[PDB]
CSV table of C-alpha atoms in Angstrom, one decimal:
chain,number,residue,atom,x,y,z
M,18,UNK,CA,-47.6,84.3,71.4
M,19,UNK,CA,-47.1,84.4,67.7
M,20,UNK,CA,-45.8,80.5,67.7
M,21,UNK,CA,-42.6,79.0,67.1
M,22,UNK,CA,-41.0,75.3,66.8
M,23,UNK,CA,-41.3,73.3,70.0
M,24,UNK,CA,-39.5,70.2,69.5
M,25,UNK,CA,-37.2,71.0,72.3
M,26,UNK,CA,-40.4,71.1,74.6
M,27,UNK,CA,-41.2,67.3,74.2
M,28,UNK,CA,-41.1,64.6,76.8
M,29,UNK,CA,-41.6,61.4,77.2
M,30,UNK,CA,-41.1,60.8,73.4
M,31,UNK,CA,-41.3,57.2,72.0
M,32,UNK,CA,-41.4,56.6,68.1
M,33,UNK,CA,-41.1,53.4,66.4
M,34,UNK,CA,-41.8,51.5,63.4
M,35,UNK,CA,-42.9,47.8,62.2
M,36,UNK,CA,-44.5,46.1,58.7
M,37,UNK,CA,-47.4,43.3,59.8
M,38,UNK,CA,-49.7,44.5,57.1
M,39,UNK,CA,-47.3,43.1,54.8
M,40,UNK,CA,-47.4,39.8,52.9
M,41,UNK,CA,-44.9,38.2,54.5
M,42,UNK,CA,-42.6,39.7,57.1
M,43,UNK,CA,-39.7,41.4,56.3
M,44,UNK,CA,-40.7,42.2,52.7
M,45,UNK,CA,-42.4,45.2,51.6
M,46,UNK,CA,-44.3,44.4,48.2
M,47,UNK,CA,-45.9,47.3,45.8
M,48,UNK,CA,-48.0,45.3,42.9
M,49,UNK,CA,-49.7,44.3,46.5
M,50,UNK,CA,-49.2,47.4,48.8
M,51,UNK,CA,-48.1,47.0,52.2
M,52,UNK,CA,-46.5,49.6,54.2
M,53,UNK,CA,-44.8,51.1,57.7
M,54,UNK,CA,-46.2,52.1,60.7
M,55,UNK,CA,-45.0,54.8,62.9
M,56,UNK,CA,-45.4,54.4,66.6
M,57,UNK,CA,-45.3,57.9,68.4
M,58,UNK,CA,-46.4,58.8,72.4
M,59,UNK,CA,-45.1,62.1,73.5
M,60,UNK,CA,-46.1,64.6,76.5
M,61,UNK,CA,-46.0,68.4,76.8
M,62,UNK,CA,-46.6,71.2,79.1
M,63,UNK,CA,-48.2,74.2,77.0
M,64,UNK,CA,-47.9,75.3,73.7
M,65,UNK,CA,-49.5,78.3,72.1
M,66,UNK,CA,-51.3,78.5,68.5
M,67,UNK,CA,-48.8,78.1,65.8
M,68,UNK,CA,-46.2,75.9,67.9
M,69,UNK,CA,-45.2,73.1,65.3
M,70,UNK,CA,-42.7,70.1,65.5
M,71,UNK,CA,-41.1,67.9,62.9
M,72,UNK,CA,-40.6,64.6,61.8
M,73,UNK,CA,-37.6,64.1,59.5
M,74,UNK,CA,-38.4,61.0,57.2
M,75,UNK,CA,-35.4,59.1,55.1
M,76,UNK,CA,-35.3,59.9,51.7
M,77,UNK,CA,-37.1,56.9,50.5
M,78,UNK,CA,-40.3,56.9,53.0
M,79,UNK,CA,-43.5,58.4,51.0
M,80,UNK,CA,-46.6,58.9,52.6
M,81,UNK,CA,-48.8,59.7,49.3
M,82,UNK,CA,-47.4,60.0,46.1
M,83,UNK,CA,-50.0,62.1,44.8
M,84,UNK,CA,-48.9,65.8,44.7
M,85,UNK,CA,-46.2,67.4,46.6
M,86,UNK,CA,-47.8,67.6,50.0
M,87,UNK,CA,-50.1,65.4,51.6
M,88,UNK,CA,-52.0,66.3,54.9
M,89,UNK,CA,-51.7,63.4,57.4
M,90,UNK,CA,-54.1,62.8,60.1
M,91,UNK,CA,-54.2,65.0,63.1
M,92,UNK,CA,-53.2,64.2,66.4
M,93,UNK,CA,-56.6,64.2,68.9
M,94,UNK,CA,-57.4,64.1,72.5
M,95,UNK,CA,-58.6,61.3,74.4
M,96,UNK,CA,-61.8,62.4,73.0
M,97,UNK,CA,-61.4,62.8,69.5
M,98,UNK,CA,-60.7,66.4,69.3
M,99,UNK,CA,-58.7,68.7,67.1
M,100,UNK,CA,-55.3,68.6,68.6
M,101,UNK,CA,-52.8,69.5,66.1
M,102,UNK,CA,-52.8,69.5,62.4
M,103,UNK,CA,-50.1,67.4,60.2
M,104,UNK,CA,-48.7,67.9,56.5
M,105,UNK,CA,-45.9,66.3,54.6
M,106,UNK,CA,-43.6,68.1,52.6
M,107,UNK,CA,-42.6,65.6,49.8
M,108,UNK,CA,-39.2,68.0,49.0
M,109,UNK,CA,-37.8,68.4,52.9
M,110,UNK,CA,-39.6,64.6,53.5
M,111,UNK,CA,-40.5,65.6,56.8
M,112,UNK,CA,-43.9,65.9,58.5
M,113,UNK,CA,-45.2,68.8,60.0
M,114,UNK,CA,-47.6,69.2,63.0
M,115,UNK,CA,-49.2,72.7,64.3
M,116,UNK,CA,-51.0,72.6,67.3
M,117,UNK,CA,-54.5,74.0,67.9
M,118,UNK,CA,-56.0,75.7,70.5
M,119,UNK,CA,-56.9,72.9,72.7
M,120,UNK,CA,-53.0,72.3,72.5
M,121,UNK,CA,-52.8,75.6,74.4
M,122,UNK,CA,-55.6,75.4,76.9
M,123,UNK,CA,-54.3,72.4,78.5
M,124,UNK,CA,-51.1,71.0,80.7
M,125,UNK,CA,-51.1,67.5,81.0
M,126,UNK,CA,-51.3,67.2,77.3
M,127,UNK,CA,-50.5,63.7,75.8
M,128,UNK,CA,-50.0,63.1,72.2
M,129,UNK,CA,-49.8,59.5,70.4
M,130,UNK,CA,-49.8,59.4,66.4
M,131,UNK,CA,-50.2,55.5,64.3
M,132,UNK,CA,-49.2,57.1,61.3
M,133,UNK,CA,-48.9,54.5,58.1
M,134,UNK,CA,-45.8,55.2,55.7
M,135,UNK,CA,-44.9,53.8,52.4
M,136,UNK,CA,-41.4,53.3,50.9
M,137,UNK,CA,-41.2,56.0,47.6
M,138,UNK,CA,-41.6,54.4,44.4
M,139,UNK,CA,-39.7,57.4,42.7
M,140,UNK,CA,-36.3,56.4,44.8
M,141,UNK,CA,-36.6,53.0,45.6
M,142,UNK,CA,-37.4,52.3,41.8
M,143,UNK,CA,-36.4,48.6,41.3
M,144,UNK,CA,-36.3,46.1,43.9
M,145,UNK,CA,-34.2,46.1,46.9
M,146,UNK,CA,-32.9,43.4,49.7
M,147,UNK,CA,-32.8,45.0,53.1
M,148,UNK,CA,-33.5,49.0,52.5
M,149,UNK,CA,-33.6,51.2,55.8
M,150,UNK,CA,-36.0,53.1,56.6
M,151,UNK,CA,-35.6,55.8,59.3
M,152,UNK,CA,-38.3,58.6,60.9
M,153,UNK,CA,-36.6,60.6,63.2
M,154,UNK,CA,-37.3,63.4,65.6
M,155,UNK,CA,-35.5,65.2,69.0
M,156,UNK,CA,-32.9,62.4,70.1
M,157,UNK,CA,-35.0,59.3,69.3
M,158,UNK,CA,-35.1,57.8,65.9
M,159,UNK,CA,-36.5,54.9,64.3
M,160,UNK,CA,-34.8,52.4,62.0
M,161,UNK,CA,-36.1,49.2,60.1
M,162,UNK,CA,-35.0,47.0,57.6
M,163,UNK,CA,-37.5,45.6,54.8
M,164,UNK,CA,-36.6,44.3,51.2
M,165,UNK,CA,-38.5,46.2,48.8
M,166,UNK,CA,-40.4,44.1,45.8
M,167,UNK,CA,-42.4,44.7,42.6
M,168,UNK,CA,-44.3,41.7,41.0
M,169,UNK,CA,-42.7,40.3,38.0
M,170,UNK,CA,-44.4,41.4,34.6
M,171,UNK,CA,-46.9,38.6,32.7
M,172,UNK,CA,-45.3,36.3,29.8
M,173,UNK,CA,-46.5,33.2,27.6
M,174,UNK,CA,-44.0,31.9,25.6
M,175,UNK,CA,-45.9,33.3,22.5
M,176,UNK,CA,-45.5,35.0,19.4
M,177,UNK,CA,-41.5,35.4,21.0
M,178,UNK,CA,-42.2,36.0,24.5
M,179,UNK,CA,-44.7,38.2,24.8
M,180,UNK,CA,-44.1,40.3,28.4
M,181,UNK,CA,-46.6,42.9,30.5
M,182,UNK,CA,-47.0,44.9,33.8
M,183,UNK,CA,-48.6,47.8,34.9
M,184,UNK,CA,-49.8,49.6,38.0
M,185,UNK,CA,-51.6,52.6,40.0
M,186,UNK,CA,-49.2,54.6,40.7
M,187,UNK,CA,-50.5,58.0,42.2
M,188,UNK,CA,-54.2,58.3,43.5
M,189,UNK,CA,-55.3,61.9,43.5
M,190,UNK,CA,-57.8,61.2,45.8
M,191,UNK,CA,-58.9,64.9,46.4
M,192,UNK,CA,-58.9,65.8,42.6
M,193,UNK,CA,-60.2,62.1,41.7
M,194,UNK,CA,-56.9,61.1,39.5
M,195,UNK,CA,-55.3,58.3,39.0
M,196,UNK,CA,-51.9,57.1,36.8
M,197,UNK,CA,-52.0,54.0,35.4
M,198,UNK,CA,-48.6,53.3,33.9
M,199,UNK,CA,-47.9,49.9,32.1
M,200,UNK,CA,-44.8,48.7,30.4
M,201,UNK,CA,-45.3,46.5,27.2
M,202,UNK,CA,-42.4,43.8,26.3
M,203,UNK,CA,-40.9,43.7,29.5
M,204,UNK,CA,-38.6,41.5,29.0
M,205,UNK,CA,-37.5,43.1,25.9
M,206,UNK,CA,-37.9,40.4,23.1
M,207,UNK,CA,-38.1,40.5,19.3
M,208,UNK,CA,-41.9,39.5,19.0
M,209,UNK,CA,-43.9,38.7,15.9
M,210,UNK,CA,-47.5,37.7,14.9
M,211,UNK,CA,-49.0,37.7,11.5
M,212,UNK,CA,-52.5,39.4,12.2
M,213,UNK,CA,-51.1,41.4,14.3
M,214,UNK,CA,-50.2,42.4,17.7
M,215,UNK,CA,-52.1,44.9,19.8
M,216,UNK,CA,-52.3,46.7,23.9
M,217,UNK,CA,-55.7,47.5,24.9
M,218,UNK,CA,-56.1,49.6,27.9
M,219,UNK,CA,-59.8,49.0,30.0
M,220,UNK,CA,-61.5,48.2,33.2
M,221,UNK,CA,-61.8,45.2,34.2
M,222,UNK,CA,-65.2,45.0,36.3
M,223,UNK,CA,-68.8,46.1,35.6
M,224,UNK,CA,-68.0,48.5,38.3
M,225,UNK,CA,-65.0,50.1,38.0
M,226,UNK,CA,-64.7,54.3,37.8
M,227,UNK,CA,-62.2,55.1,35.4
M,228,UNK,CA,-64.1,56.7,33.0
M,229,UNK,CA,-61.2,56.8,30.2
M,230,UNK,CA,-63.6,58.7,28.2
M,231,UNK,CA,-61.7,61.7,29.6
M,232,UNK,CA,-58.4,60.4,30.2
M,233,UNK,CA,-54.5,61.2,28.8
M,234,UNK,CA,-52.6,58.6,27.7
M,235,UNK,CA,-49.1,59.4,26.8
M,236,UNK,CA,-46.2,56.9,25.2
M,237,UNK,CA,-43.1,56.8,25.7
M,238,UNK,CA,-39.9,54.3,23.4
M,239,UNK,CA,-37.4,52.9,25.1
M,240,UNK,CA,-35.5,49.8,25.8
M,241,UNK,CA,-35.9,47.3,28.5
M,242,UNK,CA,-32.2,47.5,29.8
M,243,UNK,CA,-33.0,51.5,31.2
M,244,UNK,CA,-36.6,50.7,32.9
M,245,UNK,CA,-37.9,50.2,36.5
M,246,UNK,CA,-40.1,47.9,38.6
M,247,UNK,CA,-41.8,50.6,39.8
M,248,UNK,CA,-42.4,52.5,36.2
M,249,UNK,CA,-41.9,56.3,37.6
M,250,UNK,CA,-39.0,57.4,35.8
M,251,UNK,CA,-37.4,60.4,33.5
M,252,UNK,CA,-39.6,59.9,30.4
M,253,UNK,CA,-38.2,63.1,28.7
M,254,UNK,CA,-34.9,60.9,28.4
M,255,UNK,CA,-36.5,58.6,26.5
M,256,UNK,CA,-38.4,58.6,23.0
M,257,UNK,CA,-42.3,60.1,22.9
M,258,UNK,CA,-44.6,58.3,20.6
M,259,UNK,CA,-48.0,58.9,22.0
M,260,UNK,CA,-49.3,61.0,19.0
M,261,UNK,CA,-48.7,58.2,16.4
M,262,UNK,CA,-49.9,54.8,18.4
M,263,UNK,CA,-53.0,56.7,20.0
M,264,UNK,CA,-54.8,59.7,20.9
M,265,UNK,CA,-56.1,60.8,24.5
M,266,UNK,CA,-59.8,61.2,25.7
M,267,UNK,CA,-60.7,58.0,23.5
M,268,UNK,CA,-64.7,58.0,22.5
M,269,UNK,CA,-64.9,54.4,23.1
M,270,UNK,CA,-64.1,54.4,26.5
M,271,UNK,CA,-60.8,52.3,26.4
M,272,UNK,CA,-57.7,52.5,24.5
M,273,UNK,CA,-56.4,49.8,21.9
M,274,UNK,CA,-53.4,50.2,19.9
M,275,UNK,CA,-52.0,48.3,17.1
M,276,UNK,CA,-48.2,48.3,17.4
M,277,UNK,CA,-48.1,46.0,14.1
M,278,UNK,CA,-46.5,42.5,13.4
M,279,UNK,CA,-43.3,43.2,15.3
M,280,UNK,CA,-42.2,44.6,18.1
M,281,UNK,CA,-38.2,44.9,18.2
M,282,UNK,CA,-36.1,43.3,20.7
M,283,UNK,CA,-35.2,46.8,22.2
M,284,UNK,CA,-38.3,48.3,21.5
M,285,UNK,CA,-40.7,48.7,24.7
M,286,UNK,CA,-43.1,50.8,25.6
M,287,UNK,CA,-43.9,52.7,29.1
M,288,UNK,CA,-48.0,53.9,28.7
M,289,UNK,CA,-48.9,56.6,31.4
M,290,UNK,CA,-52.5,57.1,32.1
M,291,UNK,CA,-54.2,59.7,33.9
M,292,UNK,CA,-57.9,59.5,34.4
M,293,UNK,CA,-60.8,60.9,36.7
M,294,UNK,CA,-61.8,58.2,39.0
M,295,UNK,CA,-64.7,57.5,41.7
M,296,UNK,CA,-65.2,55.2,44.7
M,297,UNK,CA,-63.5,52.2,43.1
M,298,UNK,CA,-61.0,51.1,40.4
M,299,UNK,CA,-59.7,48.3,38.8
M,300,UNK,CA,-58.4,48.3,35.1
M,301,UNK,CA,-55.7,46.6,32.7
M,302,UNK,CA,-53.2,46.9,29.4
M,303,UNK,CA,-52.9,43.6,27.4
M,304,UNK,CA,-50.7,42.8,24.5
M,305,UNK,CA,-52.4,39.9,22.4
M,306,UNK,CA,-54.1,39.4,19.5
M,307,UNK,CA,-57.2,40.7,17.9
M,308,UNK,CA,-59.5,38.6,20.1
M,309,UNK,CA,-57.4,38.2,23.3
M,310,UNK,CA,-57.6,34.2,22.3
M,311,UNK,CA,-53.5,34.5,22.1
M,312,UNK,CA,-52.1,37.1,24.8
M,313,UNK,CA,-51.4,38.6,28.2
M,314,UNK,CA,-52.6,40.8,30.5
M,315,UNK,CA,-52.1,43.2,33.8
M,316,UNK,CA,-54.8,44.2,36.4
M,317,UNK,CA,-54.3,46.4,39.2
M,318,UNK,CA,-57.2,47.2,41.8
M,319,UNK,CA,-58.2,50.2,43.8
M,320,UNK,CA,-60.9,50.1,46.9
M,321,UNK,CA,-61.1,51.6,49.2
M,322,UNK,CA,-64.6,51.6,48.1
M,323,UNK,CA,-65.4,54.3,50.6
M,324,UNK,CA,-62.3,54.5,52.4
M,325,UNK,CA,-59.8,53.4,53.2
M,326,UNK,CA,-57.4,56.7,53.3
M,327,UNK,CA,-58.7,58.7,56.2
M,328,UNK,CA,-58.9,55.9,59.0
M,329,UNK,CA,-60.4,58.0,61.6
M,330,UNK,CA,-60.0,56.0,65.0
M,331,UNK,CA,-57.6,53.5,65.3
M,332,UNK,CA,-56.2,51.8,68.2
M,333,UNK,CA,-53.7,49.0,68.5
């Protein structure tokens, strides 16, 4: 009665994948944010309370970089009912569903899942040609090859070849926090400008809900060679300069940094920022003069105004 794993006890199970939501077929771009799509139907006799089943995922499929386990939409009855809750574990990269009472009470129980997955920005660090994505279960599996790109930085042949890129990586929706990483001097070029060079992080639209006011910025220093497209890497193994360039929890409500007149060929900076967050946000980082007359910037929005994470009810 206590419950147990029942993946064996599964019939007519058909699982698949695809894209569609992607810019242009055969390619998945983060700086834009597209996804995969697990088609999954199945039938079963009877199941008790705790009974569960896995969905083995490849070492590169992520559901939500946030935390170390994300809850995924449950399976439902034709009449939208609690049928089986789901939960993705980042360490064992597999999704798990634990049935409920409804599941026990019935016999001709048929379930279906249309879950949208993404590539993992921690493993698929840089850009790839035809990556392999696979979702497995009992006997049936589900392959699909897609490319994985990250829009280039932004550059103007000014002050030597000023370059910048940025991106919202994790979005702790529950706790309401984001991680807005940014890279300075991506191309990695020796760049100078009398009157100085600066970097400023701020929310771009009158109605962003960043609240940098209560954010935590942390800066690391490195070399363009060993840096990633996704910006998600092992920072300890690189110099921490935060303390000397800027302090977290800025009163102004935006960070501004004076790098000085020169940034060396090798000198590149990773700026991780963790802020609060509300309905929607869109913010950028710059690399310009005290004015932004001459400079460069990179924005990255998120909205999802009142959505679109928990998209209850969806059929295609």
